[PDB]
Amino acid sequence: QNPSVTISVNANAGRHPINPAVYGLAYATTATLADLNVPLHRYGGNNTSRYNWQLNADNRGADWYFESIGEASSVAGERGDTFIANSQAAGAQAMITIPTIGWVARLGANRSKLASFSIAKYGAQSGNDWQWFPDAGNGVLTSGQNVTGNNPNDANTLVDSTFQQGWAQHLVSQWGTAAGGGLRYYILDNEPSIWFSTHRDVHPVGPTMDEIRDKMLDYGAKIKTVDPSALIVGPEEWGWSGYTLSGYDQQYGGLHGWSFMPDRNNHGGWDYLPWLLDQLRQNNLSTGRRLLDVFSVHYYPQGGEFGNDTSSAMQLRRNRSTRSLWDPNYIDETWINDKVQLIPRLKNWVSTYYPGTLTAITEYNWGAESHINGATTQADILGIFGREGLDMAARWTTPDTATPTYKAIKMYRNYDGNKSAFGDTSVTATAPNPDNVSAFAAVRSSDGALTVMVINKYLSGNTPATINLSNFTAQAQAQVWQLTAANTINHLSNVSLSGSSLSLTLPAQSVTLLVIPAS
Ligand SMILES: [Zn+2]
Ligand SMILES: [Zn+2]
Ligand SMILES: [Zn+2]
């Protein structure tokens, strides 16, 4: 039905390891972490920036009327300990976000809720938590203008690095050091550059690159001192603009155009993250101690695919927009309007401004989770991650178990229900056009088997495909597992060799895994 495709896989080219940390997830259950066989679990997000560990509570920020709400438990840090217990109960490494913003939540009498923009204290506003906290306004006047001189102490308390160090001490005491099997990843806040938006109530002015640098040096030292075996992750920036412009400049730009970036101008025209990395590198050179271990950013496509729009046009965009993660000649079809090639960009930035620093995308989501288009896209993302050498990744939230996207992940980490996974040694696999059909390959170390994932992104018609192998002696038959809109991981009939190649027909919008044993 569709034009035939030839995919060549050379087990001897592009050889490099695939860190299983690329299959990371945020907010999943022990059951899911175990079923999907994911080794990384992330506790992060907007509210985690306002978490007070001694009170065991946080502020929802712009997400929910800037309300300070406590957890049921009054035990300092139980949220974190419960998160960690659930993670290792599934054999997964946990990541805990440690506030750096300073203003964390505090509570009222008997752990009662507090609000940063009390309507009674600041006047009528365009929004409020009418159903659960009517006095909690959205911080916007009826005129549409933001409320301004609000007192940050209304629902918060100013804390510092020594305060957070205490949490690290609590963590190490309860779980041990990282070297001993305790918390391995400490994340420094969340999307700091846009604190002036998400955490407007407590940080109305965007942070300069100086203040983000100082906070990482400061908070990073405190944590390393408590646990030198632990790994620090940051800066968790939000997206494109936050890669070259500090929060101060992003905000300034929004208010006066982009003809003059003050913070950038005071730093020799340097780009934000490159400068931050270089700045950390210099400090590492002066003290001889590494404070940052993993360079992390978040990335969500901007063309509108993040959501549930499953029209043909959007599905096609999802088939393409995925290039922004690796393709150097792909201009993002959005306001970004530039060649982002994320992973190569992150790798080059680390290699150029702070060698030895790992790379990660701690937040991403291409949408359409309950739709096959979302699954082919997710499977595409996972393949790209392993091929491009991303060190770690954390999908923003875990897809529902009934979803086809959930299976897409499973196709890589537990396709047979036996925890069998995609290979750990990436090898070259080239497809003539990833937009309609992409492929990824690797060689498993335990089995020695060659695993080849083929994604047919075409919206209709069967697609005949032939896989040509190079430098791999395989048995006469390759196993086949497949996923389609039928939302079921099917174990198809084996396919036979025809020398050093195998052919098969690929259904439209499908994820097929080929397990080719060695010898
Ligand atoms: Zn600040
Ligand atoms: Zn304690
Ligand atoms: Zn400076």
Helix (H, G, I), strand (E, B) or coil at 460: coil
Ligand closest to the CA atom of residue 173: 2
Q: What gap in Å lies between CA 17 and CA 432, rounded to an integer?
A: 24
* Short-list 79, 87, 104, 70, CA closest to 170: 79
Residue 515 identity: V
From the CA of 81, how far away is ligand 2's center (Å)?
10
Distance 354 CA to ligand 1 centre (A): 24
> How far does residue 189's CA lie from ligand 2's centre (Å)?
21
Per residue in 34-61, is it b (16+ CB within 10 Å) or e — as a string?
bbbbbbbbbbbbbbbbbbbbebbbbbbb
Nearest to 111 by CA among 69, 152, 168: 69
Q: Do 67 and 155 touch, CB atoms closer than 8 A? A: yes
Between CA 246 and CA 252 the distance in angstroms is 10
| 206 Cβ neighbours under 8 A, 6+ residues apart | 193, 194, 195, 196, 246, 247, 248, 249, 250, 251, 252
Pairing of strands 437-443, 185-188: unpaired
Nearest listed ligand to the Cα of residue 218: 1
In sequence order, the β-bridge partners of residue 519 are none
**List of domains in the chain:** 1-17+420-519 (2.60.40.1180), 18-419 (3.20.20.80)
Q: Where are the beta strands (DSSP E) in 312-371?
A: 358-364
* DSSP-H helix ranges across 354-509: 372-388, 404-413
**Annotated resolution, angstroms:** 2.3
What three-state secondary structure class fits 205? Answer: coil
Distance between first and last Cα of the chain: 35
Count CB neighbours of 90 within 10 A.
19
Residues making up the annotated binding site for Zn(2+) are 170, 210-211, 256, 267
Q: How far is the CA of 266 from the centre of ligand 3 (A)?
A: 7
Residue 203 backbone phi and psi in degrees, to 5: -155, 60
Tell the burial category of 6 from Cβ atoms under 10 Å away from its Cβ (0-12, 13-18, 19+). Answer: middle
| Nearest CA among 301, 188, 196 for reference residue 240 | 301
Is the N-terminal amide bond of 235 cis, ω within 30° of 0? yes
**What is the 3 state secondary structure string of 379-420?**
HHHHHHHHHHCCCEEEECCCCCCCCHHHHHHHHHHCCCCCCC
CA distance 202 to 116: 8
Gap between the Cα atoms of 168 and 426, Å rounded: 36
- Residue 394: closest CA among 115, 197, 187: 187
Q: How far apart are CA 487 and CA 402, in angstroms?
A: 8
Q: How far is the CA of 245 from the centre of ligand 1 (A)?
A: 16
Burial of 144 (0-12, 13-18, 19+ CB in 10 A): exposed
Question: Is the Cβ–Cβ distance between 73 and 80 less than 8 Å?
Answer: no
Contact by Cβ (8 Å): 162, 222: yes
In the reported structure, the alpha carbon of residue 261 is separated from the centroid of ligand 1 by a whole-number distance in angstroms of 19
Query: Locate tokens 């994911």: which residue?
Result: 38
Tell me the residue type at 130. Answer: W
Which residue ranges are tagged as binding site?
A: 170, 210-211, 256, 267
Tokens at residue 272, please? 């934000």
Largest CA distance in the chain: 79
Q: Which sign does the torsion angle of CA 148, 152, 155, 161 carry?
A: positive
Measured in Å, residue 195 CA sits from the centre of ligand 1 at: 9
Taking the C-alpha atoms of residue 377 and residue 384, their distance in angstroms, rounded to an integer, is 10
- How far is the centre of ligand 3, averaged over its atoms, from the C-alpha of 265 (Å)? 10
SS3 assignment, position 377: helix
What separation in Å is there between the alpha carbon of 345 and the centre of ligand 1? Answer: 28
CA separation for the pair 378, 367 (Å, rounded) = 9
* Beta strands at 40-43 and 24-26: parallel, antiparallel or unpaired: parallel
Ligand nearest to the CA of 247: 1
DSSP β-bridge partners for residue 428: 10
Number of CB atoms found within 10 A of residue 383's CB: 27
Rounded CA-CA distance 65/139 in Å is 8
Centre of ligand 1 from the C-alpha of residue 159, in Å: 11
Secondary-structure percent of the chain, ordered helix, strand, coil, rounded to 5: 30, 25, 40
315 Cβ contact list (under 8 Å, min separation 6): 368, 371, 373, 459
DSSP string, 11-72: TTSS-EE--GGGGEEES--HHHHHHTT--EEEE-SGGGGG-BTTTTEEE-GGGTTTEEEE-S
- CB of 415 within 8 A of CB of 37? no
- Closest listed ligand to the CA of 80: 2
Burial bucket for residue 177 (CB in 10 Å: 0-12, 13-18, 19+): middle
- In 3-state terms, what secondary structure has residue 449? coil
Which amino acid would we find at residue 129?
D
Q: What are phi and psi of 6, to 5 degrees?
A: -115, 125
